[PDB]
Every structure is written in C-alpha cells, then in structure tokens.
Amino acid sequence: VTIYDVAREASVSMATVSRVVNGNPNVKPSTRKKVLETIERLGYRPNAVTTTVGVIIPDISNIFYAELARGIEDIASMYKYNIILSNSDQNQDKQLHLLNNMLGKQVDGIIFMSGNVTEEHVEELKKSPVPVVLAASIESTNQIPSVTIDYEQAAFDAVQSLIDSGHKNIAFVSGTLEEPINHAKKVKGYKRALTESGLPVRDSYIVEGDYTYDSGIEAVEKLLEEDEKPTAIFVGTDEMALGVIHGAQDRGLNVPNDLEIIGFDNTRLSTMVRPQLTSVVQPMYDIGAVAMRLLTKYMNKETVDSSIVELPHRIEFRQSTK
Amino acid sequence: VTIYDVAREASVSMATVSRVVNGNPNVKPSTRKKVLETIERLGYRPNAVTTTVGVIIPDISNIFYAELARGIEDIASMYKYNIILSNSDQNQDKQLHLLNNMLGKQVDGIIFMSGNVTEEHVEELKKSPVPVVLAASIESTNQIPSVTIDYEQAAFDAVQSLIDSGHKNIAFVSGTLEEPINHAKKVKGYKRALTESGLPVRDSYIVEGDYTYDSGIEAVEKLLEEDEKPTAIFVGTDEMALGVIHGAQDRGLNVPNDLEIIGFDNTRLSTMVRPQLTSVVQPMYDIGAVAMRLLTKYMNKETVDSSIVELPHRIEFRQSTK
Ligand SMILES: [Ca+2]
Ligand SMILES: [Ca+2]
Fold this sequence. Notes:
3 domains; six-stranded mixed beta sheet; six-stranded parallel beta sheet; elongated; about 40% helix; CcpA (chains A, B); Rossmann fold; alpha/beta; DNA-binding transcription factor activity (chains A, B); binds calcium ion; 11 helices; homodimer; 434 Repressor (Amino-terminal Domain); transcription (chains A, B); activator (chains A, B)
C-alpha cells in the first residue's frame, strides 16, 4: 500500500495525497476527508517503516482449476508467500499480456496453466527473468519446468481397460491434433495400448474434434459410419465424450453395452451424463501443490534434479464402461 | 487517451510523460524512447484538440449472456455509442463495486444483469446519477426500469403444455424461493396454470433446489418419494432439469414416457442431455437490444411510457416432453 494506491482509490493525484498527508491547509476539506478515509481503509502509513508468485489459469470458476488453485494456495499459506492469481480465459494474445502483467507487478515467480501452450509463449517465458513452471500444461519442447500427469501413460491405461474388457476395435476422439497433449501424448498412448496387444492402428479410428460437445457428436457419427464399427471409444476430454455418448445414443446404441466410452479430466460433466462417464482423473490439487514447490526450489536457487515432474493419475470407472 | 493513460502504460509518472512530451533533454533516452512508443501506440496527441454505457453481466463466455451482449452491442454500433462491458461472476459485494466502477469511469448509463438482484442493489441504483435499466433481471420492487420476458406467463405456458398433454400431477423444482423470479413469478405461473385447469396446488410438489445439477437430482428423488408421484415436472432452470432428468433415469423411469420434464433459459445444457430438454427460450438478443434502446430513451430525457418492458418468450419443444 503506497501513495499511488491511495491516489487511485481516492480518485485523486499522488501530489494531492501527499498534500493531505503533509497536512496542507488549503486542500478542500471534502477531498481531505475522502483521502484520510482512504488512508485509513487501506492501512496507509505516511512513514517509511517477502516473496510472491503470479498464477495464470483459464478461469477461477472451473472446478478442476479451482483444486489446482487450492493446492497452489495451501503451499503459499505454509510458505508465507502471497498469491497474485489472474483468470485468463486462455487465449494467445491475452494470456501473454497477463503474463507480462505479473512481471510488471514484481512477482518472484510464475505458475502458468493453459490447454494450448503455444511455441510463442516459450520464447517469452525464457526472457522472463523470474522462474516459471507450468501446471497441467505441456510444451513438447520440454525446456520449461512442468508438473503434470503422464498423459501418454494415462491414455495407455484408459485404452487398456477397453482392451482388457475384450474390445479389438477401439477408436480415439481427439482434441485438435496440433496440440502436443494430443499428437505427442494421447494419440501415442492410445497407439501404444493397441500395438502392445497386437491390435490394429487404423488412421480412420482417430477422429479430430475441437473440444466441443458437438464435435464429439460428429465424431461418433463418423466412427459409426466406418466399415468395422469401433465397439469402444477413448475421448480426449469429457466435453467431447458427452457428445460421443449422446450421438451413439441417438443412433440407437447402448452405452456401455453396444459401445464403451472413456473420457478424461474427470470434469463436472462426467457425472452429468447417463451413463456417467468413466474418466481419467488428474490430481489437480497435488499438481498445484508440487508446481508451487518446484517453483520455490528454483526461486531459492536450489538444485532441482528433474524439471519435468509426472504425478500418478487414476481412472474413475463409472457406467460408460461396463 | 490522456497523459495518465500513457503513464500507466509506460510504467512512468504523468510528470515524466509531460517531460518527454515537452522534449525535456535530461530524460533518460530509454525512458524517452519507451514513452514515445507508448504515445504513438495509444495515439496520444499532446495538443488539446460522445455517449457511452456501462454493461454488467455475470460472464462474457456464457452463450445466453453472449446473445444479450450482442444485442446491446449492435444498438451501440448504430447509435455510435461505445460499450464498457464488465464480467462480474454475479456476487453481492463484487457486482456493487463493478457498478461504482462504471460511475467512476464516466458512463452515461448502465445496463445491469444479475440472477439475484438484491434489495441492497436498488438503494444504490437510485443514488446513481446516470440512468440504469435491468436486462433479464427483476426486482419485485419495480422502481428500476426492466426489460425481460414475462416470467409468470412463461411459467404458465410451460406447465400448460404438461396439462394439455394429460398430466394432473405436476411438480415444480425451483431455484431458491427467496428470489422474485421464483416466488413471485415462476411459482405463481405454475400455480395459476394448475388452478386454471382445476388442478390441485400441493405444497409438496414445490421443491426448492439451489440452481445446481445435484439439487435437481435431490429434488426428483424427493418428488418420487411422494404418495401420488408427479408424472411431470417443471424446472426453473436448465441445470437443475438435467439433474431432474438423470435422477428419474437413475430411478428406472423413462423421460418422457414415465415422467415429462420442462426446463427454462434454453441453455447449452438443454441440448446436452438425453432426452434433449424442452425449455423456455428467452429472446436474449432482443432483451439486450431493447434494454439499450430503453436506456437511451432515459439518457435522451425522452418520455418513456412503461418502464417495465416484457418481451415474448417461446418454448423449444424437444424430447423431454412427449
Ligand atoms: Ca453423416
Ligand atoms: Ca432419500
């Protein structure tokens, strides 16, 4: 809290705040009153008389960003570090500004979270003086410290449970393939699970959605038009999965009996469909906590050993698998 | 764009910006460079050389707030008025500040939108010098200009289609009853539709949810425990309706065949369940447009005649009714 903070708050100039502070007798009584109340309310002391991290995540409101922020928050409380958090609505030329907004507010470190981490973001993360560590976000470049689950393995495990259940024809509905989470991790996890059981990797069992429910609807439809129809489908995110489920249901198919579906992220939506969606669970609270610790390690100039941290994931088996 | 705007943007004082503007020769070249670029980028002219409205709505992102903002926006473009829009996440002691943030940025008028309009908000809306008009929001007090649908009638019409379909035992799952939209409008609409067909108004057919999906689940469950089970249910919002649908489905009941359900607001969610949700549609784009016109009328000191404007609603009949 400084003169500047009082001025903004009292809709007045720094020089006026100083004037009031100095007991200048020609300040309009009302403005003097206004700024003294501001001075008191903010706790501004007129006598010259710590470590914070900036956090950027898509939105405050989303439940799975919310246990990440708590994980971040709880480490901050213990460590006596303050949090500056900003809800971004993750977009390219608006998460970048919210990044440099942290740098211009004297943060000692940055925790960053975005679904699509651009190559452009990395070139500005390296120039950033303070250390930064990604939470539940991956850049295939692997220069920037990251703490996440093992997306490839989680993909593998999801498709594995389909395989273990007797399915030979198993499809994958992806978010945009250009993103590493998809082409570098989930696609490959899905592929590996197939090849390891001597199953066929068909290009036409990999359909690309756009993360919307509808693209999910379109994806099952396209899959159901295939010669040998898939009898199970892994879906890269929950929102698409509901679309996958409902399009199947619209085509007269039963989930799980005619078609088994598995999702990802264990969002609120996974329990807002019938059958409820089997979905890969990330430990968002832990990812936040560990991110905060990893960030601290760098900030404290400590030898990290391993900059890419991978936490266990699990699968909440619900009714969309049998 | 003023000296102040350049200063904030160039992370520098007004006096420094003036110094650079005046060609003061002892300003550090780099800071002179920094502020000249800021001056150019913002379009600041150093020579002394219109009507805007503030808009407060829960969030930018939500599709049904998004055709309201477009309706607002399109009237603004025509009228050559600029929009200052703020996403609130509608809460009591945070929508109030975002209201006075408009007043402190010299807006000529305010369009306000919130699910729960508090009595406290009205006492601060009257003191506000510039005129304000509520969009898709109601204060039972009816002092403050409002443009909305006819909630009572829309409720009536929803329950009417159940009645017309042969249902005698019809329940209502409400959002919190304390809010006028519910107790003063939808409850009464629901009641009227019953009494007008000589049907019974049972206290136990009115259950109170909290706008969550889950409270919806709990509400059907409680309804299904009744002696004479309702065979149709009106639900005050879509989110609760999905909960209502799924709890019925979980109890082995078919929607629409064992239980007909109707929702409200025609949110994205209404088409993200099976059966798709029959739901009252508001014309959000029109409510925004008309709100903007009504606001203009007041701002132009024009004789309004009728401060409470009610627009037609309709019902998107989907599969949750037969
Ligand atoms: Ca087709
Ligand atoms: Ca019970």
